[PDB]
From a paper:
Cholesterol-dependent cytolysins (CDCs) are pore-forming proteins secreted by more than five genera of Gram-positive bacteria, including human pathogens from Streptococcus, Clostridium, and Listeria. Other CDCs, such as intermedilysin ([name]) secreted by [name], achieve species-specificity for their hosts by hijacking the cell surface receptor [name] to initiate membrane binding. A long extended domain 2 (D2) flexibly links D4 to the membrane attack complex perforin (MACPF)/CDC domain (comprised of D1 and D3 together), which is responsible for pore formation.
Here we report a structure of an early prepore-trapped conformation of the CDC [name] solved by cryo electron microscopy (cryoEM). We then used cryo-electron microscopy (cryoEM) to visualize this [name] variant in complex with [name] anchored to cholesterol-containing lipid nanodiscs. The data were further refined with local symmetry, resulting in a map with an average resolution of 4.6 Å. The final local resolution-sharpened density map illustrates an arc of five [name]–[name] complexes, with the central subunit best resolved. Our cryoEM map reveals an oligomeric complex whereby a single [name] can interact with two neighboring [name] monomers ([name] and [name]′). In our structure of an early prepore, the h-helices of [name] are arranged parallel to the membrane with their charged surfaces facing the outer leaflet of the lipid bilayer.
Residue numbers in the entry:
A (entry chain A), B (entry chain E), C (entry chain C): 56 to 326, 335 to 350, 356 to 528
D (entry chain F), E (entry chain B), F (entry chain D): 1 to 77
The structure:
Amino acid sequence: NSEAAKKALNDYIWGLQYDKLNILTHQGEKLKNHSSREAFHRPGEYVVCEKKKQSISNATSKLSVSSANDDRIFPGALLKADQSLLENLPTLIPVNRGKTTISVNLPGLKNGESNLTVENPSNSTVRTAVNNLVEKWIQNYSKTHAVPARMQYESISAQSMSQLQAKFGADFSKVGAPLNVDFSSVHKCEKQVFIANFRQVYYTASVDSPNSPSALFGSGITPTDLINRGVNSKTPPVYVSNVSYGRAMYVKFETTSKSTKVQAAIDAVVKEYENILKNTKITAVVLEASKVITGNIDTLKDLIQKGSNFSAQSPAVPISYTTSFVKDNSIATIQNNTDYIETKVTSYKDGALTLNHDGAFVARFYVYWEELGHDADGYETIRSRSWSGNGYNRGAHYSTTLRFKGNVRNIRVKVLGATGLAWEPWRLIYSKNDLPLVPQRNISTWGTTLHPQFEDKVVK
Amino acid sequence: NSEAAKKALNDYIWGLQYDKLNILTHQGEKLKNHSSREAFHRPGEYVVCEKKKQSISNATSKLSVSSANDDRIFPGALLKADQSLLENLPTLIPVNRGKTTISVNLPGLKNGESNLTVENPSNSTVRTAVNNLVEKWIQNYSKTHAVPARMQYESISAQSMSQLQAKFGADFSKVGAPLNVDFSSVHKCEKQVFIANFRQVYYTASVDSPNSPSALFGSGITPTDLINRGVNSKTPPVYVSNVSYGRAMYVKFETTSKSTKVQAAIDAVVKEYENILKNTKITAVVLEASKVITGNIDTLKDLIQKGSNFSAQSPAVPISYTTSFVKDNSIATIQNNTDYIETKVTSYKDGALTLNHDGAFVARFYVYWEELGHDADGYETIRSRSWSGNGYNRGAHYSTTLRFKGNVRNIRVKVLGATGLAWEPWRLIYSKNDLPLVPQRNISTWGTTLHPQFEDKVVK
Amino acid sequence: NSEAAKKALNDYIWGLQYDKLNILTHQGEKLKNHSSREAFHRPGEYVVCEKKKQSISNATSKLSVSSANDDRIFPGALLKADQSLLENLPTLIPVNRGKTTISVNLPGLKNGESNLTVENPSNSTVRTAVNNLVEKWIQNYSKTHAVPARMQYESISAQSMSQLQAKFGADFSKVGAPLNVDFSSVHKCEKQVFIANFRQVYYTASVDSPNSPSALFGSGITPTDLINRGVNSKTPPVYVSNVSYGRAMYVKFETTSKSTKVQAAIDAVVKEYENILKNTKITAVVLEASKVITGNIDTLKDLIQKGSNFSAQSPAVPISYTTSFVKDNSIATIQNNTDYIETKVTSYKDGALTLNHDGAFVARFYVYWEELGHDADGYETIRSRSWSGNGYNRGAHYSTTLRFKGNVRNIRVKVLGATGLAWEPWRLIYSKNDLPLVPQRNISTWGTTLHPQFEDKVVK
Amino acid sequence: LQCYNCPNPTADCKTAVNCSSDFDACLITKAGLQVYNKCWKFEHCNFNDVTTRLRENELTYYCCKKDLCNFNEQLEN
Amino acid sequence: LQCYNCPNPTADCKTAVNCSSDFDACLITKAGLQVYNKCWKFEHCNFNDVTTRLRENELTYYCCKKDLCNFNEQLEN
Amino acid sequence: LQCYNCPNPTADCKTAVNCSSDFDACLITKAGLQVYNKCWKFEHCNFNDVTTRLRENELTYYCCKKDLCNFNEQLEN
């Protein structure tokens, strides 16, 4: 039976032919290259936006699985290769399944504990089978086993959420849906949100490829059975080749500030800036168990630190899977893309600058400034800016305030210690150009007209 | 007989056909193309509303579990695709139901105590089966029972109700009726509603793949029977596949202050929010209910503190539902739409702003303001205004109070050191433009003539 | 049976021959040779990047393996020579293998005794056999023996993912996703990214190369099935020969401070620098992990001290493999070649020059410079620069700091201690050529005309 | 939608024009002696952008959505 | 677009040409009295860059990006 | 391409011809009164390089990439 069934199913599927990366490709969002630089001034702050196109086209074969997909995924189960598989909309089949050995990867088992075999593969049967294989090792050796597997510490900015579906996978569309990820904000330059995946795979399960097509059916598949079970050329039959398992989490940080020191916040919580912490507004979907529920500096640290390893009780859930074209037993692979005008946003602080002349001599200051702006037409421009009080004398002691505004850039200073001598009584103490932006700079001169000293303090 | 029943049901159900999403696509409210920003003044108060279109078409395959639908928990309760089903009304049917394997999954479960079978599926039969299974696992292991920490914490702006009909589902229409999500007030731009759904799975259930529709029926069903049984082509049969069971906490924070900080506040205690909560009179509902209905600080961390263990104390509910098409065993899913207005709203502060010119150096106070308003047409505007004695002298000591209304924006303050020299006689101590609204501000100058200092002080 | 199978199969695979090293050659980025030199000015820093074509042509048989392909990694299977084989997404096959032996590098033997075999391999069968032997040796002698304790710590500038594809293989393309390498910031001279790949070997497994073609298949392999299997010159069979075992660590040091000191920075941690490390953006992947998960100043120190000293705490994970053309039975090597741009990572900075004169004689300094400049197109040029204090008299003391910018090059100094004698009123105290830039250079003179002595202090 | 849409740094508004693109409002500005009226983008209406596009530190302005309601005397003094 | 591309710094401002990416910017420099309006690179436009390509230390400058708008009277003494 | 080459140092630098790859740029130097412009290898362009290939010690020179673009008057005075 299963032999004639095998040859029938093989004469059927071997002729069926198509490219996975064509049926299985998620090219979500397309965007023309719009290059929009723009600016904005806020109370004591400068802001630049760079809406610049960034396509993100990815491909992968690790098909994610989460809560709302748990029950229908497990290995060896046939599926119909469709957009169904793409967004993790996994469809079953009524076809009776046949004798298959089922394999697992478990660290430490002893020579008989990692292989089983099911005649009629069934979610209940194979599920309790692998659960048995786990229950073997969970109590036996857990005293001195520390599976050091992947501590995938992935971070990215939560940009246009279709770029998240591309870089991370289609099905995230649901599971990160409650993450309170603001699509428009980053898309329209409102706020900063960064998402960081953390994982640890615990184990996986594997199928031996059908040496017999009807080694996949319960002894007697007929092509008309397969087609009455909905399998055709368009959504061809593939067979799962893996299910993976382990601890997972998708922790976010949601704050006003750009300049990905946001990511510094993310990591140094995983590992002023105190206030960018104070502006947390976290929203996280996770998957002690109460320090799981509170969420803070110590919580994730411990959960990836002491909780990452196989728990005192149990692991979480299937993490991913993969499938394979029954025709050639060719491995499957997604291709997920999204194009978006990435705005790498940058701020510029309102600088302040106090000008202190406590030197005995009378110094003369010129302070050259750069100026980045536009001209009445949305067209950019860059310009000089002159110290209007130039060529001026300053008292023995002196201190003035200057809004060294966030609009200012690329400063240069010449200070001039006046000397009573005749050979060029203009004596240069300090010319220096190309300096950075200081929230509160103090240019304080010092010394005597014979030796003009200087101090460049930052009072803060 | 049962073989002919299977054949006839598969045949007709293959002849049965529908765009399953068409029968299962939903629309909620719809709003015409209106969007507008409008301000409003009040005695000692100022507000700006941005009433902008809110439109969402969200969907899933997790289905809710509530009283009016509690009738068909213990999955496998085959339904017939209807808008009743769309808005959470299942179709009971006195059908002879045939044996199938039903399997519920648990953490740490026994080797073979996840597999079950039922000859005649019925709420009583399958209910006793799963009762006895979970009772085995509740007496066996629940002493050391720990959860896979599936904290699916969710928060949303509950500004619209049809938005909560699309996002969280149609059935919520009733389950939120006791929660009192006063979305209408939000549309009237008066009151703010934020919903927080804590969820958690404790386990869930599963059914074998139906090789036949009559693989569900007892034996000998004919198509015209199911026709008379109510399940027909127009309302095609849908094969339930899973119910999820666990903990929930369905909180609505009701508060007028339209600072979006509310969605920090609602959760900042789950971790200012204090005072904004002080007069909220929060209302809650659980799907020890009365322990929640009164409300306290640690209710949620109790939903894990107790919600780590299961006991015989107080009811924990089935939490979600799902179902799949019968014709081809394809997964079924909703498509709910909402269209309404969101109103992003704010406020700004009128208070006593005191200018305290007490420095021994008589400074001159140029002060400038921007003022956003309207008149006689409702067409928007914003204009310049300047100080009364703008850049005009002030007495040696002068503490003036201003009914500094929060309606104006973008202040600029130049305090002027008075000098009698020719080259730039206007001497600057502090000219900072575009400065923040301080409701009650003691804006004073200070320092000496050789060191003029500003004081950005708040009275308090 | 298996003998006629073997004779037909040997002829078959011998006819299936093609160039292994060219069916496995991955020629990557095709670049024109251009050296585009161009400088930029950071606020106080003079960077010069000459992008240049740098051809990275490579080939190897050290085929690494990651998590996304643990499902297929062990020696013994039968693969198919294809781009799939190229991109480390192994191809499946309905081949039922035949009797073959397997060898295991057990530290502690004195002959070829610890060997095994399978009459009909299946991933479960050979997997449990190998893990049997592994656990067997782990429980016996590894408690009381040595192990290779050596440091294989590769490093490279992550200039390109094509550069990294040629350096460390093709499939790193996916595995390097969480590495946080901004090789494009290197493409644009924004930041510098170096990877430090510390792989970790503990063991490896081998398999007897095909001595009988049908010893690689169940008795009675027919090539008709193999073309029905896709095994033909189109995609002829390939024979895995080895699979590694161990751990890995891909430290990603990414600094905004563009320099080569990056590697010294790594080596400052492997065995001031505070600053170069302060902009680390360290992003480590793993191919237990807790020892790295905590983070410290000697985490690599112990990761080789204890991690490379891999003990019975918990066995490692498969790391890599190799294969052989079944006919060839000889090493199979991909040739992953690429060209790629090579930013000249160089950088230069300003540095003060404190012309300090204290001697009792009348001294005069002349400092000449070479001068990096551009003309009329941005065209490069070098220039003379003459001292402004040349032909300029200086008192008994003269200390002014020349803003001797790194943008200036090839400084030369002459200091004149003038004498009272009519004939040659000049006396040289100090004159130097071939002197480099100094951050702070107190160039001082002291003594009187008869004995002018020098001082060259770098206060720094 | 007929603002004053005519670029003129003078004391008189030349032509009342129905502008759409940069008539989200109409804006007039007095800097010392000079005064300028033109269609304007209301979100871009603010003290700082005005003083930048003017370079003069002492100024006053009035921008209003209504058609021609940005007429000269609607700016005071 | 068309930048003003003066050949050598001078009070003369007549030669306006449609320029390549070297009209990344329109450049005009008043150094002392000598004025120069050239095609230029905006990212390469700055105090430092223009002072180098003009070889002198002290300088007054303006850059525009739009066609020819960078002007002489655009600079004010 | 065609660069200035006088083997004899001259203030009036006139003899400019098409030369080979040895030189890289046009180099003019001045010592006292003597002036020497020449095709010069820009790597072999260096203060010490010029002083050794000229057998003299004190000078002021300048070499520019594009040929013929080098002359004495560009040096100060």
